[PDB]
């Protein structure tokens, strides 16, 4: 990620969590990446514990997020000559969603006591509404390309861990070592403890 800081035109870690330089000293695994585009003032809505327009109908961020989000401006790739109406956003649901899941459903939301058999009538509308994306729009309406990076730690053996190449080995010296994300100081002696493969 040292070169990926500037291989793509995005703001370098405008989020909360582990320090960007300190990410080399982690043994996280099983990352999750989601791809979506937001509109203008929705940057503030994507935060752990935030309750915004996105955080009330589209994507819920739990308090124990153990990560952050990455967003940047996209006024050229996401904005063609014609209006870009290829992405929509939910506004109508009976209740809030559950964190870290998605529920896509093309269903008419009913407001009144009477039910609707998929008919947009008196008190029955659709939650999905088209984005207003145009290259001539202002900063409050420009499409922003957003990807979320999760750095949670699992008790399972980390198949990803951290990118810290390889180095030599030493024995019988009280030295500080960081193994599987845990720091400890001591010698490296030989013991006859039986180890099962797991």
């Amino acid at each position, epitope marked *: 990620y040292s070169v990926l800081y500037n291989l793509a035109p995005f703001f370098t870690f405008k989020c909360y969590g582990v320090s960007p330089t300190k990410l080399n000293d982690l043994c996280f695994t099983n990352v999750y990446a989601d791809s979506f585009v937001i509109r203008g003032d929705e940057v503030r809505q994507i935060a752990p514990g935030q309750t915004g327009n996105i955080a009330d109908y589209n994507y819920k961020l739990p308090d124990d997020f153990t990560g952050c989000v990455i967003a940047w401006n996209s006024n050229k790739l996401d904005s063609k000559v*014609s*209006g870009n*109406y*290829n992405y*929509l956003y939910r506004l109508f649901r009976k209740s809030n969603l559950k964190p870290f899941e998605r529920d896509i459903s*093309t*269903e*008419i939301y009913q407001a009144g006591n*009477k*039910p609707c*058999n*998929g*008919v*947009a*009538g*008196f008190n029955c509308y*659709f939650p*999905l509404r*088209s984005y207003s994306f145009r290259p001539t729009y202002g900063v409050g309406h420009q499409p922003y390309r957003v990807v979320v990076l999760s750095f949670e730690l699992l008790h399972a053996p980390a198949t990803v861990c951290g990118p810290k190449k390889s180095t030599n080995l030493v024995k019988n010296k009280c030295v500080n070592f960081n193994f599987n994300g845990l720091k400890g100081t001591g010698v490296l002696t030989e013991s006859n403890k039986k180890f099962l493969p797991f």
Partner: antibody, heavy 132, light 113 residues
């Protein structure tokens, strides 16, 4: 749907290309239908199709004629739509309306029966001539 | 398919008094949750048709208050209170029970001037 492209002389053994040239509009997520019309009085629906946003299945709705000869091809990525066919036997004057259904969702619809509310997005530009 | 009739096609409409149109459907619309499966389409000659009344007896699409659909049971009717020069267009009725939609014959609507 705003304008349509069509016209030209085609042999009965040839193939046409019925397309609607859209503009800034939510045509990608709106299901539509094709309705033809006789040169005299009286319309006739010919074809319909939905999008992948509604469901994994395409919610296929074919009559006898389109099952016999026609086929559909939805890009499901932009505001484009094309109609394909192989031959031509009795096709003199067809309006071929490009209207869309007044039902964003598809509910209580089988593979052969599906209620529809109304249409309001008819267009002009799909003329066919074979006698030229 | 469903056959339809258009016996009010020869309707000499005049401004000042109401006029009515009707059509016949072979199947019954009673199997519904209070939503009548009727609609009226006004086909303006030359450019594009226009939508008057959608499914059910409600007003939508910015139509004037004169247009008002009606019908309860084995009947089909449309209530028009005022007729003007902008009412040049034929009418159609449709039932959405089956996917092979087949519209009936057209009307004339000669304004008795």
């Amino acid at each position: 749907q705003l304008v349509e492209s069509g016209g030209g002389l085609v042999k009965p053994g040839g193939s046409l290309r019925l397309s609607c040239a859209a503009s800034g509009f939510s045509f990608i997520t709106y299901n539509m239908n094709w309705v033809r019309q006789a040169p005299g009085k009286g319309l006739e629906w010919v074809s319909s199709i939905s999008s992948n946003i509604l469901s994994s299945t395409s919610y296929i709705y074919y009559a006898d004629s389109v099952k016999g000869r026609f086929t559909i091809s939805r890009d499901d990525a932009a505001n484009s739509l094309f109609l394909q066919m192989n031959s031509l036997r009795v096709e003199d004057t067809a309006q071929y309306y490009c209207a869309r259904t007044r039902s964003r969702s598809v509910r209580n619809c089988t593979s052969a029966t599906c209620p529809v509310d109304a249409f309001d997005l008819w267009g002009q530009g799909t003329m066919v001539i074979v006698s030229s | 398919d469903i056959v339809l009739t258009q016996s009010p096609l020869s309707l000499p409409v005049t401004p000042g008094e109401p006029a009515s149109i009707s059509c016949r459907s072979s199947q019954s619309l009673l199997r519904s949750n209070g939503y009548n499966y009727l609609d009226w389409y006004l086909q303006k000659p030359g450019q594009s048709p226009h939508l008057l009344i959608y499914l059910g007896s409600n007003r939508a699409s910015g139509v004037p208050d004169r247009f008002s659909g009606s019908g309860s049971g084995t009947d089909f009717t449309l209530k028009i209170s005022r007729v003007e020069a902008e009412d040049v267009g034929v009418y159609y009725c449709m039932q959405a029970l089956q996917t092979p939609y087949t519209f009936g014959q057209g009307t004339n609507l000669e304004i008795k001037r």
